[model samples]
Target: GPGSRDVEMEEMIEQLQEKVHELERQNEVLKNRLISAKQQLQVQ
Candidate 1:
């Protein structure tokens, strides 16, 4: 019961870190798609 609070907080932080990592990876995919589309437009 004494150390439980800190342990819970650490777990939450770890989960949030994972979420941020996932968002960043997804953002990179979207960014690459946008760049590809823009480059295609430039070629045409």
Candidate 2:
């Protein structure tokens, strides 16, 4: 074996960056749903 786990760590950084963007998209989706529901609640 060798000490090349550094390569794996760099790859993971790229992979996690992609995941952060995806999570941001999902947050926007939930925000829209909450906005609509809150409007309905205000009319109550």
Candidate 3:
């Protein structure tokens, strides 16, 4: 039981890490878009 549970925990952590990376990328894209919009407004 312990061995099986350890394997499952490892898999779960890997999935969590992947999701975190995905969310960080999404946030970065939003930040870039906001910055670009502000720069365009300044130029106008």
Candidate 4:
């Protein structure tokens, strides 16, 4: 009974991977916004 933690560990690891994916998604979004901002500044 004291040796049954790998299951929980695996689940937690999966959630961490999900967080990584969301962070990457946010990264792309912010980069796109920066590109838009740069274009606006250049147009000005």
Backbone Cα, N, C clashes tallied per candidate: 0, 0, 0, 0
* lDDT per residue as tens, model 1, 1-44: 47546878899999999999999999999999999999999984
Over 4 Å off, model 3: 1-6
Query: Candidate 2: where are CA atoms >4 Å away?
Result: 1-11
Q: For residues 1-44, what per-residue lDDT tens digits would candidate 2 score against the true structure?
A: 79857988899999999999999999999999999999999994
Each model's C-alpha lDDT? Answer: 0.93, 0.94, 0.93, 0.94
lDDT of 3 by residue, 1-44 (tens): 34546777899999999999999999999999999999999994
lDDT of 4 at 1: 46
Model 1 TM-score is 0.67
lDDT of 4 by residue, 1-44 (tens): 48756889899999999999999999999999999999999983
Count steric clashes of candidate 3: 0
Ranking by lDDT: 4, 2, 1, 3
Strongest candidate by TM-score: 3
Query: Candidate 1 vs candidate 3: which has greater lDDT?
Result: 1
TM-score of each: 0.67, 0.56, 0.74, 0.67
